[PDB]
Amino acid sequence: SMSYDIQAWKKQCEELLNLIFQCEDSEPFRQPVDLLEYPDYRDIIDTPMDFATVRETLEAGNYESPMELCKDVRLIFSNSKAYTPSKRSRIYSMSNELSAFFEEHISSVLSDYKSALRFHKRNTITKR
């Protein structure tokens, strides 16, 4: 259905982050990877990312759109897949499952935002 609120994505993303933090599959991804546990991590991964950094960026007012948040969340999952020694590993199984959960929930957030932008463009004021 056609949507109108250009700002609604921000609270929807806060609520989705709350669901992710309460899911046991997020535990490896809540804080930055610890280099004392994984000494070679930065030799493999160029840009670390974690869910607390995403929430802090959102709460600071430093995302312009839900698409920018989605890019940083997807980086969490692609870093786990690049770092895993095996597609059968525990930590990669958790990120793979959490990625399916996130994609199911983010879809409507993106659709509603893009619909609100179209409505805004439809109604641009030019005569004054």
Q: Which residues have CB under 8 Å from 95's CB, separation 6+? A: 25, 28, 29, 76, 77, 80, 81
Query: How many Å apart are CA 119 and CA 23, to the nearest integer?
Result: 35
Residue 98 class from Cβ within 10 Å (0-12 exposed, 13-18 middle, 19+ buried)?
Answer: buried
Fold of 9-122: Histone Acetyltransferase; Chain A (1.20.920)
Provide the 3-class DSSP secondary structure of residue 48.
Answer: coil
Q: What share of the chain is helix, strand, coil (3-state, %, to 5)?
A: 65, 0, 35
Boundaries of every domain in the chain:
9-122
Tokens 């199911």 identify what position?
104
Per-position DSSP letters for 100-121, written without gaps between them: HHHHHHHHHHHHHHHHHHHHHH
Residue 15 to residue 12: CA distance in whole angstroms = 5
CB 44 within 8 A of CB 74: no
- Consecutive H or E run containing 85: none
Q: Do 76 and 94 form a contact (C-beta atoms < 8 A)?
A: no
